[model samples]
Target chain A: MNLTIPFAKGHATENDFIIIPDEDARLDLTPEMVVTLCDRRAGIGADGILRVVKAADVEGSTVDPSLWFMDYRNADGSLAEMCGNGVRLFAHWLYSRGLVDNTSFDIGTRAGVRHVDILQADQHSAQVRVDMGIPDVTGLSTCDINGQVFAGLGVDMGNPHLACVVPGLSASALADMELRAPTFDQEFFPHGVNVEIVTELEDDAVSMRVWERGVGETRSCGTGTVAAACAALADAGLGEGTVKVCVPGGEVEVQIFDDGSTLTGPSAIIALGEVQIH
Target chain B: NLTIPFAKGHATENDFIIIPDEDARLDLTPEMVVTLCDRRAGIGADGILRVVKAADVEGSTVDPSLWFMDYRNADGSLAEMCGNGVRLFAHWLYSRGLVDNTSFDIGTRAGVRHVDILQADQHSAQVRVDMGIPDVTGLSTCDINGQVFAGLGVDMGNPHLACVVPGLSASALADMELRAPTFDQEFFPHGVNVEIVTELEDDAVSMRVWERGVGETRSCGTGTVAAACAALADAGLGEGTVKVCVPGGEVEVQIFDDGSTLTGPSAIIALGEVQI
Candidate 1:
């Protein structure tokens, strides 16, 4: 029988997603279907999709049965390991729908389990904080941008990223740089890596523009902020600290510790509706 | 509390948020339209469709037995007419029982357009729109992505420059970066929609468009008609049916001696009440 599926649209610092609630995990969502749903002109446009599923219903899930799973898919229908901004929005939806009564809980993802805390939430908006896990500083790497090579710091935050802190390049100059595509070393990252062009740390904050691995240049990248923070701290000879990362969409605070990092930002649920799936 | 009713629909992938204001009572300002179409801030759409009775519209030059399609771009700029929007508007009217007849007229700033509902159910249908005649002005050129291209200037109630780029395949056309194409201000002072097309086969073509008020749109109905006219003229054919494949979907255009018609599928993807 044909049925209409209920969905919610939300974003964390302008990184938007389509939230589909399928508690039973019965919907056979194909790649083509995700592509259609994310089509800006045709379907409900989003950067990716966050399918709300119960942990018990997910196959091979080792988390608690009572927990929820975030099935993330990029706009191009590609499966992603994790999405920092997406997890926050997922937690907000669960709380707003009354599925979870608590403000803080562990949400399961393909990367692993992630803990989310709704620092403040209501029906329309919330300020969420996500535990991004320990970031692994791989080493120094270089990527090509507009035929020029720039050295970057490699950091793995569930996903791969190369945060390059450009010296003498102000935020305005970074904004003017063409960000269509960046040429990276294929051997270092065969699966592709997200690239962040960042400005030097000033007043304990940094501004950045990111070229996501799968999606093009988005307004913000939650994980990228963490990587940028780590890179900036290491550049200053400090092991860990807190820094404000200003993205085109909005501002997010990143706190780096010895073991892991946390991203605190704002999220908003803009629309709720039912869509016919055919 | 009273809720704002909105239906999300698309014609060849050019989606819009349809607002039913039967009495034409709601005052939709530019800021409201912009907020409603904001991707993250609101209900996100390429445009907004206000459904009102033709008589309720100010200075409407249409018959009383018609609905006015008050179309606005994403930025809240009023447009003369939207070809694809008209078909979706007709489908909404038929499904909601606002109009009983399968064939009816809808009013726009351009004028009244006759529509025929070929097939329809609750939420989807195939519609044919009498898009009126095309005014082939002359040969024009536009600068896009630092490259210059020659095209045909055709007016389908709206200004459009359809460029038939030879030797550029559909795949190549898809890869090129699309921004606002530069044109002579003296010729099209108000701005124009730019359609970059590639000939696939005889009587068939694929196109990518950059709208004037809006940036790169998935599909454009008037631009499709203009592309067909340009392609047919280049092939030395006056009038015939040409299947145009846009990024959003495929649509068929029939160019007659006097006018043209666009036949395509319209779909209602989502429905809900929006709080303003």
Candidate 2:
């Protein structure tokens, strides 16, 4: 990107991002530059970077050439297949900028083109709901955290997840849990996994904390929430229901059926300005 | 300030938003400070450094004509001094043509202090600051999440109790949860910045801090000065140069009978406009 890039900062449930509009995809952004941009104290602080470029500009994306491509990059300059929060903030950036004339539109991600619904939006925050796609349950797995082994239900929402729904985890125990890289079934998760330890708030509501593989504990994890909702519902012996998955960052609603799921929550637009990348 | 012009900078990753209200005419309020420092809501920062002339700023106990660092915590409360903020403040002043020399004095609530910009560019800088004579007062104790630790009292224009733990590992410091320390109110009537220190090879130390206004931050410049003072005594050196390793990065502090100087890196990462 340009040394001086225009950017906006926003968050979905406090999983914030730096949205740089590279509509033409002319900027040859390097990994080091991405790391510099994502530095919380030195550069613009964010969980990741959401680069907006036309789908056609993306070299090999098979999505419709007319849509906008959400180029999501993790904080460590890693490519992300799909980011649940990134899409909502991505859609809002397009909508707010008049790039997309409608509230509901299909945006291209690394995973695929997923649709979003802007249920409500103002200057600061928007109630956004995005189609999270179908959950692919890969049976039960085990994860170790703070020495306690948890029976984790493996699910792939584009990304891998081990959602461990602990039945009797006290709220204090849940809050005090310091999640780190854990010893998991390496053979089962050959590519590593996002770990979410969840405790049910009610039959239809649950609280979750996720420890991403490369990234440490975040305020919220979009895909992890979806996996958490699936595990929480499956633990209740139900496959189809609306689950209120509350994260440390904020609460998000996940609607799951036998087919697919949808995540609903807030995406807040806080700061808009230019930043010096070099 | 309604439509404020500002730049964001950091020394050792202790970030601050520099607001140029030179005449103090904008009436920068606590609520506005809170808004600008909001990580998820506004132009997020650890604190703010309002660059106003001491003459125009109220309660500035320095030369009236000097540039005053109107420092505020993330929560919008006023603070006396910030070691990291001062270096970034000086760098911003020099970078913007506000000052001509690589070395100059800047005013703060504590007092005016000297800064020497070593190497700088539009993006990054290394500066040395005269943090004044650190008063290593006596032995004291503080409780971090109910675990009491013994340490030496040091005042780097602000209060600190740097506890030097000999055997604490780098991972332990990284993993230790630093809640606000509980101490004698008489010792720290205002508040305190607590530093958990571990000895490194030679004259070096690794430390983490729980600051007063902010909780645990990446680095605390003043806290490092305190850590160095306590670490030197812990090593029985009394006075020397110590490389202080903070979570953000590293800084070198040289202690002397006269005073102390801290050398560290600073960066002016962003510059733009923000509305109050």
Each candidate's interface RMSD: 1.6, 1.9
**Local error of candidate 2 at residue B220 (angstroms):** 4.1
* Candidate DockQ scores, in order: 0.61, 0.46
Q: What share of the true interface contacts does each candidate keep?
A: 0.61, 0.54
Put down candidate 2 lDDT per residue, B1-276, tens digits, no spaces: 246678887888889988888666788789888978877657789899988888887777688888888899888988777788888888888878888999888988787889999987777788999989899888989988879899999987778999999889878888988787898789888888889999756778889988876678788888888999888888887788999999889999999988999999888877777665
Q: What is candidate 2's DockQ? A: 0.46
Worst lDDT run of 10 residues, candidate 1 chain A, spans: A1-10
Per-residue lDDT tens digits of candidate 1, residues B1-276?
235778898988878899999988798889889988987667788789999988887788789658889888888988777888888999998989988999988888888889999998878899999988899999999999789999999988779999998898888988999888889788897799999998637779999999886688788999999999998887788898999999888999999999999999899989877766
lDDT of each: 0.87, 0.85
Alpha carbon deviation, residue B99, candidate 1 (Å): 1.7
lDDT for residue A59 in candidate 2, whole number 0-100: 79
- Runs with alpha carbons beyond 4 Å of true place in candidate 2: A141-144, A149-152, A166-173, A176-183, A201-204, B1-4, B23-43, B53-58, B61-65, B97-105, B116-128, B136-154, B158-220, B223-257, B263-265, B274-276
lDDT of 2 at A117: 88
Q: What is candidate 1's lDDT per residue for A1-278, written digit by digit as tens?
A: 34587888888888999999898888877798888788766778888899998888878776787789888898899887688888888888888889988898889887778898899998778889999988999889999988888899999887789999888888888889988779988888878999999988889999999998766798999999999998888888899899999999899999999987999998888778888765
lDDT of each residue in A1-278, candidate 2, tens digit only: 33888887888888889888897788877778889988878788888889999989987787999999998888888887678887888887788778988988999887888999888876666888999989999979998887978998999988889999999986578898777778899999999999999996485788898898877688898999999999988888888899998888898999998889999988877777788874
